[PDB]
Amino acid sequence: MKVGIDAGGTLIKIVQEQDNQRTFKTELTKNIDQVVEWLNQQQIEKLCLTGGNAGVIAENINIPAQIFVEFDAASQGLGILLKEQGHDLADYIFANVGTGTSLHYFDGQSQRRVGGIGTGGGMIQGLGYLLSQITDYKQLTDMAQHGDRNTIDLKVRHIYKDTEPPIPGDLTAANFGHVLHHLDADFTPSNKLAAVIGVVGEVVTTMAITVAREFKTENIVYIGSSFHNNALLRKVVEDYTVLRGCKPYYVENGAFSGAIGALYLE
Amino acid sequence: MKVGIDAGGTLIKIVQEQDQRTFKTELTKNIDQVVEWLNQQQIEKLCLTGGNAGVIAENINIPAQIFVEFDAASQGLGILLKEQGHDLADYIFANVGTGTSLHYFDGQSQRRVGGIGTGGGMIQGLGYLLSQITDYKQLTDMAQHGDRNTIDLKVRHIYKDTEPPIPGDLTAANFGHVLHHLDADFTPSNKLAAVIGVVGEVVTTMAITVAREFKTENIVYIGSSFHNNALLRKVVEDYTVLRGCKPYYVENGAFSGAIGALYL
Ligand SMILES: Nc1ncnc2c1ncn2[C@@H]1O[C@H](COP(=O)(O)OP(=O)(O)OP(=O)(O)O)[C@@H](O)[C@H]1O
Ligand SMILES: Nc1ncnc2c1ncn2[C@@H]1O[C@H](COP(=O)(O)OP(=O)(O)OP(=O)(O)O)[C@@H](O)[C@H]1O
Ligand SMILES: COCCCCCNC(=O)CCNC(=O)[C@H](O)C(C)(C)C
Ligand SMILES: COCCCCCNC(=O)CCNC(=O)[C@H](O)C(C)(C)C
Ligand SMILES: [Mg+2]
Ligand SMILES: [Mg+2]
Secondary structure: OOOEEEEEOEEEEEEEEOEEEEEEEEHHHHHHHHHHHHHOOOOOOOEEEOOOOOOHHHHHOOOOOOEOHHHHHHHHHHHHHHHHOOOOOOEEEEEEEOOEEEEEEEEOEEEEEEEEEEOHHHHHHHHHHHHHHOOOHHHHHHHOOOOOOOOOOOHHHHHHHOOOOOOOOOOEOOOOOHHHHHOOOOOOOOOHHHHHHHHHHHHHHHHHHHHHHOOOOOEEEOOOOOOOOOHHHHHHHHHHHHOOEEEEEEOOOOOHHHHHHHHHOO | OOOEEEEOOOOOEEEEEOOOEEEEEHHHHHHHHHHHHHHHHHOEEEEOOOOOHHHHHHHHOOEEEEOHHHHHHHHHHHHHHHHHHOOOEEEEEEEEEEEEEEEEEEOOOOOEEEEOOEEEEHHHHHHHHHHHOOHHHHHHHHHHHOOOOOOOOEEHHOOOOOOOOOOOEEEEEEOOOHHHOOOOOOHHHHHHHHHHHHHHHHHHHHHHHHHHOOOEEEEEEEEHHHHOHHHHHHHHHHHHHOOOOOEEEEOHHHHHHHHHHHOO
């Protein structure tokens, strides 16, 4: 058994390989001690680590472990997954929407980090909590899928009214910009959470399309566990990527790109 | 008297020229009062721009020229920069209004190179949801000495005792420390500082990205979102500098569009 681990800020992704049978396992980073205990009882032929919490694992386990930089690991694993799933992309932006968001240009050969932003899954959870008091991820995301953003977000057409706007009227002009115009109207937990997801999605996508233009690629691959149990986030991102003339791709087990990559790096 | 008006989503900026230049701000909610004021005046030249220009034009009883806000903003900003002793060959300008519009000025003309809904509208709206404060001066004042430490997650918090691949002091996740501090008091000042933080960081990130793309080191920040918000100015300024770019603020930068409308 070969094991790759991407121990990130919020989730630990574990890939176990045995004779080309893969196991994909998610654990909370808060439960890292259990991952360590588990590892110490396993028969491991090779162990590769990546992510911010790789060191916490390495220092507490009884076996050697190779450690890799998460950006290279993510790129390597993502390339593997893309090819397995029948995407032959000459080049692409990849946006890793984790606790935070890291943006990369893959030129066909190697990755380069071309940007990043603190709008990601961490913000969804944290700001989500401040606005709703919900700490449970599944509960938080499920609720948001039922939300309406109309009373919260301001569109271009709301600013331009009955005049022709210089960019499309349906675009978000200001996230949370309708709130002060709806002070009688209600800001239900679902509606508020949908708007949080909305801003995070729009920001990530905006950054991704911008660097896509900069590096002259139309392909944008979105990965990260922030897309799990969040159809709304996937939709916000997908729709706006398409609107901007780019091609969005999601990847089966994309959140495990780093963990897979760690196993296959030299 | 010549008059230029930039009637935006939140504020109406009025520039009056007689000889002497005068600057006046009114709330877009009070657009009816601007209209009343205009209808009394003998105006030799009246120019309008911004989203609510049409509401003004359709309720006034005189003619008016209407200009596109992007060109107007560029024109007026160029004028202000020269008046204030800047000779910039080229630059990004970021207009942080209700929403945020990004432009590359090549020395000759502007091109819109991006935009984002993180701006002054979000500061007010999300600020309200987290603090129940509707008064702008109260909201921004309350944010000024907030502490973001219990709210925001840094790169070094994720990487712990290992060397991170990007600087450890960088924000990794806005609001990403909240779940690690559930026993803590999320005070209104702390929450609002975090709101300003995310807006500032997003705007700056976009500006520095297009600055790299279009090969300019100069980033000029305008918009009324910088009024009564030293913290926003600081978040933006510090991160722009960190990213190897030169940030500029402009006296009356928020009136760039209103001035520009007069001179187009
Ligand atoms: N079971 C879960 N528990 C908590 N968050 C989850 C869960 N499933 C999905 N998420 C979402 O995924 C995000 C984490 O994504 P991911 O695992 O890609 O990041 P990470 O690798 O831990 O973070 P980073 O790469 O920034 O260190 C969370 O912030 C949350 O939005
Ligand atoms: N007195 C005030 N009242 C309300 N908001 C204010 C005030 N002073 C500054 N602001 C801030 O300025 C922002 C509006 O900035 P600005 O005047 O540049 O936008 P706008 O032109 O009205 O909007 P847009 O160009 O996106 O249509 C507000 O969202 C708020 O953050
Ligand atoms: C002082 O901070 C200014 C704000 C800078 C914002 C830019 N932040 C980033 O690029 C980091 C975003 N987060 C990430 O890339 C990931 O979460 C890692 C895990 C930190 C790589
Ligand atoms: C459907 O949502 C699409 C995502 C929108 C993201 C981009 N939005 C924008 O660029 C508009 C931002 N706002 C602005 O430029 C200004 O506020 C104006 C006044 C609308 C020009
Ligand atoms: Mg990660
Ligand atoms: Mg404006």
